[PDB]
């Protein structure tokens, strides 16, 4: 009358002086649990171990709070189905190569700061008309944003890039870079050339070697790898 | 009211002096075929580059010229199975890096970025690597 | 025992959703040194999950008039909405949506290059006599996602000092004036006092008071509880909106835009039953009518699925190109959470808690008000906007795509009212050195709680009590049982048991502090429901099935004796709680029926409400 | 020039294409024309390739310059030895033919 599924979860407590990172095993009856991994994490926190800490909010894959490494791959716990194979133990880690605040909560301050550094907002050279009439944009030029604006900033793609592991301090990563591309090709933006000159350095953009782990792990089905390649094509063709 | 440069400096200054651990990555992340093929392209590149430089150093430091060492190997009368092993082992990294290099040049044109195409192009590179390494090593 | 860090700004905003962000950089846009306190990263707020769109009479799809949107919202509110605030919201709607598009919001486009607008529930032309309206501006079906990320990116251009992962505990009150907020830094476990001349509350709703809700786990009504603990009243908390199409199981939202593009509701026999409940509007009636209609179809024996506890939302009759262009988000959600291909099979849906009409009572300027001796008096230094506030532009039933409008319209209104009332850099009010120590004492008590009822168990019994005692259809006997059980749960909060003795990212303690907030909101919601003996909007009483106004507006007003104020119910409920005992005290204030200009926008008298 | 990063990326793809085009040229037209072009293309392509590995993996202002300086010396000797082999010995194309005749 049960189905015991095993979860091995990374644990670390900054409040314990001397606590070393450890894996803890929890047993969950899948008959009394939802289909997604976040449902198991919430069930464990509610009933088994209320000290288990993790980010969550929307539980529907739109906010991007519950990004973590489930079974070797970065994904959203709220949309990652539980492996019903009771023989295998699902291993849950934080996002890879990230400073751990506590348990499964990484520090995304640098990730957020890199997104601010590319100035992700509409910039027109004549902003004396802002708040008057809606800017015109054709359906075809609006279609160019499909696949780019749905990014939820979960950092599943950036934390899966090996170049981001070795050079996360100066390489922006696939998440920020795709958003930089989202504003380069926005037909309403007038700072397209300025946004490319910012990437004229060996690290911000050109640390991408087309490894393509970013696209494989994106829970939104987006392709930050292809957007980076479109940036590289723009960098080599634009004039000043 | 801090800018992104200050937030990045605050991030590193805070975390590098803290007691927070770095979450695992190498020992825990799941591998895939494109991931293994990307590093192999780097490995064969480093191997070919250092094999060219070793050959270049031998030209400046060995007391005999190339036709002499070719005659020395022939006199040893090595078996065909041993000759085929060295030919295949030497042409395999060059064959792989060449096919996967064209695949990288295709990527740089913005073509073949659908994830199902990345798996296709990788498998095509592998069979062309084996085909061109078996034909050349037979000559 | 806790290190205290004192901050001083010209204004402090508690919240980073649509309303919180728009007010945050709107104050910095006015030269105010402003802080923005939020327990989540701004793009994680519940606004990101909004799908349908935002209303505005842009006139992109047909000849429109903002006064028609005004009439729809007033009729939608069932005449519990303050018409001066509805006037302000609907007239500013074209300017607010244009401002968002100028910020870079990637709205869906028409063949003319303008913003695309879809139909939505309860929207009409020619003051309710001209046919179905199309004024819901949308980014496909990811409107709130694109609205929140555009506002967050816009806020990065101003000197707004952000405080992310800070949990606001209580307000710093002195002599009836708000001096700021006290908060807990989740990252490093320190207590922070933010002193400011003005404080804005935009903390969202409290949909998590029930067992099944479309809300996020973080929508716990923390700003509603800070007001209640401060001794100030909350307004109309018993009016809870049940969205018609919440997906079966996880309770995730399936947007009303599905019905706006052509989607219909069918029962177990494939009947479009909304043709029978509302022959004119059909599936595009008001949400309170559609939610009650779906409930009756299930309760009478025409439910769908195996357990007959839901109905079907049919979209497969629509072309697949339109589904992929207009409704891509729900197409993927219906597959992940229901295994449904919207091009072949319908979606299982049922009414689900979605939005809180009630909240912190404000005026049309965003200023929080208290009511003493029949006179609305402004609380000096306190503002509110968004779902946490009760303007009340929504009254007893909010129209779809009006909350996102409320967010940006009244979020900016708080910044505008401060910019005209106060100057930047004025002397910050001095708080006494021990201000907020009762919030720290409550935090430390819960941090070492060691009773018999853990936080997850007390939160569950509350959610199940609200779910079965203050649902769609309500009765007096069932509401009283819920009140007696909710007061017992509140008294059993002294038996709380927590396990995490830490202070850095102690989500066990934070979810317990949210439980204290949820209980205060849940008490006033069900106690305000037990007292309100009428049927208005989403508050439907099966023992008092009539709407009771000061006049019988279904008959000629000539020769009618006006009912006294204490003998009708067209009035707001004002709720108070003594947080020690859990006692709920109820008062009432009149509904503002006047507008901002009678010549420009005529006041709509109460009438019989039909769709 | 402020477009140095994008021009280096473009120059790399240009050499990779040229180096790819010399492999059929070496099989069809072996001789001193292809020998020195191979010596040039192999050195430049390998110098930039090893420079990306250093950029990705070597951190620290001193270790970065130590690795990059030793790479310039490696490439300079590599190009000088290949050009020595093409002028004083049989050449690159002839050597591979003699090697494969074994
Ligand atoms: C749930 C929902 C609502 C919704 C919708 C779809 C869903 C799934 N679609 C809508 C639509 O298409 N059109 C529309 O007009 N409305 C729609 N809604 C309703 C609407 O989105 C919400 O009412 C609105 O988004 C609420 O916005 P608001 O800015 O008022 O609040 P929020 O976005 O929920 O964010 C609240 C912020 O407050 C901070 N917070 C909360 N508590 C604290 C404490 N204690 N300390 C500090 N900060 C706090 C949070 O961080 C959050 O940022
Ligand atoms: C230790 C060093 C590590 C690094 C080694 C890799 C270095 C790669 C860079 C150099 C590549 C140069 C390749 C040049 C090959 C062509 C030269 C040539 O002329 O070879 C002829 C030979 C075929 O000869 P045959 O069958 O008689 O037909 C002649 C038709 N005209 O052609 C062949 O059949 C043999 C071709 C084999 C190529 C192997 C390259 C080296 C491995
Ligand atoms: C003989 C050759 C040598 C010694 C050599 C050497 C190298 C090296 C060392 C790298 C660096 C790999 C990395 O940093 O990941 C590289 C990269 C590359 N090689 Fe070669 N290579 C040879 C032949 C070829 C050929 C024939 C092609 C076609 C080719 C295409 C490429 C491309 C496209 C790259 C770019 C890698 C990236 O984008 O990161 N190579 N090569
Ligand atoms: C000489 C040079 C040789 C280079 C290659 C060496 C061999 C590498 C072997 C590594 C294969 O590692 C394996 O790759 C396959 C295909 O990418 C992965 O499979 C993946 O794709 C398949 C097919 O869509 C799906 O099942 C799912 O997405 C995922 O499992 C698998 O998870 C991984 O475990
Ligand atoms: C082509 O560039 C590259 N390609 C790679 O596959 C690559 C790698 O993926 C490995 C070498 C890195 C290491 C084995 C970890 Cl990430 C596996 Cl769990 C890597 O680090 C790299 O350089 C940045
Ligand atoms: O609540 C609203 O305003 C509209 C909404 O969630 C929907 O799209 O169904
Ligand atoms: S690109 Fe995908 S994985 Fe990366 S942040 Fe955006 S949604 Fe997340
Ligand atoms: S995985 Fe990394 S190397 Fe480039 S293609 Fe994606 S950002
Ligand atoms: S919790 Fe919002 S994405 Fe998983
Ligand atoms: K409200």
The tally of strands of chain C reads 24
- The total count of strands of chain D amounts to 0
Question: What is the molecular shape of chain D?
Answer: globular
**What is the CATH level 1 assignment of chain D?**
Mainly Alpha
Number of helices of chain C: 15
Radius of gyration of chain C: 23 Å
**What proportion of the residues of chain D is helical, as a percent range?**
over 70%
PDB class: oxidoreductase/oxidoreductase inhibitor
Keywords: Complex II, membrane protein, heme protein, OXIDOREDUCTASE-OXIDOREDUCTASE INHIBITOR complex
Assembly: tetrameric
Entry title: Avian mitochondrial complex II with Atpenin A5 bound, sidechain in pocket
Secondary structure elements and pairings:
The complex is a heterotetramer of chains A (about 240), B (about 140), C (about 600) and D (about 100).
Chain A: E1 4-11, E2 22-29, H1 37-48, E3 67-70, E4 73-76, E5 90-93, E6 100-102, E7 105-106, H2 109-117, H3 139-143, H4 162-166, H5 174-184, H6 192-197, H7 213-217, H8 224-235
Parallel strand pairs in A: 1-5
Antiparallel strand pairs in A: 1-2, 3-4, 3-5, 6-7
Helix pairs in contact in A: 5-8
Chain B: H1 4-15, H2 33-61, H3 66-75, H4 80-108, H5 115-136
Helix pairs in contact in B: 2-4, 4-5
Chain C: E1 4-14, H1 18-29, E2 34-38, E3 54-55, H2 66-76, H3 83-103, E4 117-118, E5 136-137, H4 143-155, E6 161-164, E7 166-174, E8 177-185, E9 190-201, H5 222-229, E10 234-235, E11 240-247, H6 257-261, E12 264-266, H7 274-277, H8 287-299, E13 311-314, H9 320-326, H10 328-336, E14 347-356, E15 360-361, E16 367-372, E17 375-384, E18 389-390, H11 403-421, H12 437-447, E19 453-454, H13 455-469, E20 473-474, H14 476-491, E21 496-497, H15 507-531, E22 540-541, E23 571-578, E24 583-590
Parallel strand pairs in C: 1-2, 1-9, 2-6, 9-17, 15-18, 19-21, 20-22
Antiparallel strand pairs in C: 3-5, 4-5, 7-8, 8-9, 10-23, 11-14, 12-13, 13-14, 16-17, 23-24
The complex binds flavin-adenine dinucleotide, 1,2-Distearoyl-sn-glycerophosphoethanolamine, protoporphyrin IX containing FE, undecyl-maltoside, the ligand COc1[nH]c(=O)c(C(=O)[C@@H](C)C[C@H](C)[C@@H](Cl)CCl)c(O)c1OC, oxaloacetate ion (OAA) and 4 more.
1,2-Distearoyl-sn-glycerophosphoethanolamine sits at the interface of chains D and B.
Membrane topology (chain B): Multi-pass membrane protein
Subunit structure (chain B): Component of complex II composed of four subunits: the flavoprotein (FP) SDHA, iron-sulfur protein (IP) SDHB, and a cytochrome b560 composed of SDHC and SDHD.
Keywords (chain B): Heme, Iron, Membrane, Metal-binding, Transmembrane, Transmembrane helix
């Amino acid at each position: 009358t049960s189905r015991i599924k095993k979860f091995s979860i990374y644990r670390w407590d900054p409040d314990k002086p001397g606590d070393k990172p450890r894996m803890q095993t929890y047993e969950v009856d899948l008959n009394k649990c939802g289909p997604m991994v976040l449902d198991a994490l919430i069930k464990i926190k509610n009933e088994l171990d209320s000290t288990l800490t993790f980010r969550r909010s929307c539980r529907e894959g739109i906010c991007g709070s519950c990004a973590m490494n489930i079974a070797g791959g970065n994904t959203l716990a709220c949309t990652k189905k539980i492996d019903p194979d009771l023989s295998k133990t699902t291993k849950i880690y934080p996002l890879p190569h990230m400073y751990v605040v506590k348990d499964l909560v990484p520090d995304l301050s640098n990730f957020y700061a890199q997104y601010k550094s590319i100035e992700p907002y509409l910039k027109k050279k004549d902003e004396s008309k802002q708040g008057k009439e809606q800017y015109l944009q054709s359906i075809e030029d609006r279609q160019k944003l499909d696949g780019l604006y749905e990014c939820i900033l979960c950092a599943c793609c950036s934390t899966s890039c090996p170049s981001y592991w070795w050079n996360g301090d100066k390489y922006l990563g696939p998440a920020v870079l795709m958003q930089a591309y989202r504003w380069m090709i926005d037909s309403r933006d007038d700072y397209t050339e300025e946004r490319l000159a910012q990437l004229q350095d060996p690290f911000s953009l050109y640390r991408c070697h087309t490894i393509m782990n970013c696209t494989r792990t994106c829970p939104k089905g987006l392709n930050p790898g292809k957007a980076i390649a479109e940036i590289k094509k723009m960098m080599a063709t634009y004039k000043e | 009211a801090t800018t992104a440069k200050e937030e990045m400096a605050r991030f590193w200054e805070k975390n590098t002096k803290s007691s927070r651990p770095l979450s695992p990555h190498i020992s825990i992340y799941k591998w895939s075929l494109p991931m293994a093929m990307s590093i192999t392209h780097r490995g064969t590149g480093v191997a070919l580059s250092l094999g060219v430089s070793l050959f270049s150093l031998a030209a400046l430091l060995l007391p005999e010229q190339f036709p002499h060492y070719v005659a020395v190997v022939k006199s040893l009368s090595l078996s065909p199975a041993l000759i085929y092993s060295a030919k295949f082992a030497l042409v395999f990294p060059l064959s792989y890096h060449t096919w996967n290099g064209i695949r990288h040049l295709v990527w740089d044109m913005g073509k073949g970025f659908k994830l199902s195409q990345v798996e296709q192009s990788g498998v095509v590179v592998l069979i062309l690597t084996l085909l061109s390494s078996a034909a050349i090593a037979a000559m | 025992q806790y290190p205290v860090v004192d901050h001083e700004f010209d204004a402090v905003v508690v919240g980073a959703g649509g309303a919180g962000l728009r007010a945050a950089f709107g104050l910095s846009e006015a030269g105010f040194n402003t802080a923005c306190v939020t327990k989540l990263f701004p793009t994680r707020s519940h606004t990101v999950a909004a799908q349908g769109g935002i209303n505005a009479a842009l006139g992109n799809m047909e000849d429109d008039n903002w006064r028609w949107h005004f009439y729809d919202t007033v009729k939608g509110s069932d005449w519990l909405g303050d018409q001066d605030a509805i006037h302000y919201m609907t007239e500013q709607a074209p300017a607010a949506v244009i401002e968002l598009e100028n910020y870079g919001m990637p709205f869906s486009r028409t063949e003319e290059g303008k913003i695309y607008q879809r139909a939505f529930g309860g929207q009409s032309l020619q003051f309710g006599k001209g046919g179905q309206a199309h004024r819901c501006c949308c980014v496909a079906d990811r409107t709130g996602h694109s609205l929140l990320h555009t506002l967050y990116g816009r806020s990065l251009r101003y000197d707004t000092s952000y405080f992310v992962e800070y949990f606001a505990l209580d307000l710093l009150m002195e002599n009836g004036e708000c001096r700021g907020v006290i908060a807990l830094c989740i990252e490093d476990g320190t207590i922070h006092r933010f002193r400011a001349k003005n404080t804005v509350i935009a903390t969202g709703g409290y949909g998590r008071t029930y067992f099944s809700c479309t809300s996020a786990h973080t929508s716990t009504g923390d700003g509603t509880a800070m007001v209640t603990r401060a001794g100030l009243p909350c307004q109309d908390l018993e009016f809870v909106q049940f969205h018609p199409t919440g997906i079966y199981g996880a309770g995730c939202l399936i947007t009303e835009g599905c019905r706006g593009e052509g989607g219909i509701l069918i029962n177990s026999q494939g009947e479009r039953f909304m043709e029978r409940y509302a022959p004119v509007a059909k599936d595009l009636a008001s949400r309170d009518v559609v939610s009650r209609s779906m409930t009756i179809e299930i309760r009478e024996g025409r439910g769908c699925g195996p357990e007959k506890d839901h109905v079907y939302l049919q979209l497969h009759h629509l072309p697949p190109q339109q589904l992929a262009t207009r409704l891509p988000g729900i197409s993927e959600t219906a597959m992940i959470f229901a295994g449904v291909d919207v091009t072949k099979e319908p979606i299982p849906v049922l009414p689900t808690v979605h939005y809180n009409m009630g909240g912190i009572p404000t005026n049309y300027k965003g200023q929080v008000i208290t009511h003493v001796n029949g006179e609305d008096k402004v609380v000096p230094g306190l503002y509110a906007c968004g779902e946490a506030a009760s303007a009340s532009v929504h009254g007893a039933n909010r129209l779809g795509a009006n909350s996102l409008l409320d967010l940006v319209v009244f979020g900016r209104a708080c910044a505008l009212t401060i910019a005209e009332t106060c100057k930047p850099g004025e002397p910050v009010p001095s708080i006494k050195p021990n201000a907020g120590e009762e919030s720290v004492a409550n935090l430390d008590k819960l941090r070492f709680a060691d009773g018999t009822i853990r936080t997850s168990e007390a939160r569950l019994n509350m959610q199940k009590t609200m779910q079965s005692h203050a649902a769609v259809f309500r009765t007096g006997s069932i509401l009283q049982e819920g009140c007696e059980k909710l007061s017992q749960i509140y008294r059993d909060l002294a038996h709380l048991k927590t396990f995490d003795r830490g202070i850095v990212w102690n989500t066990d303690l934070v979810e317990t502090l949210e439980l204290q907030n949820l209980m205060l909101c849940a008490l006033q919601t069900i106690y305000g429901a037990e007292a309100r003996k009428e049927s208005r909007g989403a508050h439907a009483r099966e023992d008092y099935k009539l709407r009771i106004d000061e006049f019988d507006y279904s008959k000629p007003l000539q020769g009618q004796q006006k009912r006294p104020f204490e003998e009708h119910w067209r009035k707001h409920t004002l709720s108070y709680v003594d947080v020690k005992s859990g006692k709920v005290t109820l008062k009432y204030r009149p509904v503002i029926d006047r507008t901002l200009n009678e010549e420009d926008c005529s006041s709509v008298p109460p009438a019989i409400r039909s769709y | 020039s402020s477009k140095a990063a994008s021009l280096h990326w473009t120059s790399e793809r240009a050499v990779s294409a040229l180096l790819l085009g010399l492999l059929p040229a070496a099989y069809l037209y072996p001789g001193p024309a292809v020998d020195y072009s191979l010596a040039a293309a192999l050195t430049l392509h390998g110098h930039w390739g090893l420079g990306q590995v250093i950029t990705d993996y070597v951190h620290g202002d001193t270790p970065i310059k130590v690795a990059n300086t030793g790479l310039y010396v490696l490439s300079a000797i590599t190009f000088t030895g290949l050009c020595y082999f093409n002028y004083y010995d049989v050449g690159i194309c002839k050597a591979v033919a003699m090697l494969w005749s074994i």
